[PDB]
């Protein structure tokens, strides 16, 4: 269930991964889990696409990856070719503090679905988390994580 009337230019800026959940434990289990990725920045292009910058722990370092997400007919859905995923779905956002999204591989969402709650500032927003829990109440998540401000402000 996606966001209607998403205006992608309004999401430009820094965001922090406050919480994440996945359908399969192995997607997020351990710092090295595939899909254990922390958003740094959202950069909409003038043409309506989205560049998403992220931190991912690889060999001891905290690496940076840049995913290009292509727009589709639906403003809230994008196409990607990264992390074995092929779709980005924006669930909800008030632009000013939180944004909820999921990635998945359309071929097999059950082994693919990972969602995140993003916040603008490195603070824990209990409202954003509440919205996140509701949106996930219907989904098959087997692992959920939430970070504190200390972790929010460190690379990876």
Curated annotation (Swiss-Prot):
One of its GO terms (cellular component) is extracellular region. It is found in: Secreted. The keyword Protein biosynthesis does not apply. The keyword Transport applies. Disulfide bonds join 62-156, 102-115, 102-117. Synthesized in mammary gland and secreted in milk. Coiled coil: none annotated. SUPFAM superfamilies: Lipocalins. Alternate disulfide bonds occur in equal amounts in all variants examined. InterPro entries: Blactoglobulin, Calycin, Lipocalin, Lipocalin_CS, Lipocln_cytosolic_FA-bd_dom. It comes from the Eukaryota. Primary component of whey, it binds retinol and is probably involved in the transport of that molecule. Belongs to the calycin superfamily. Lipocalin family. Under physiological conditions beta-lactoglobulin exists as an equilibrium mixture of monomeric and dimeric forms. Interaction with LMBR1L which mediates the endocytosis of LGB has been observed in PubMed:17991420, but not in PubMed:23964685. This is Beta-lactoglobulin. It comes from Bos taurus. The gene is LGB.
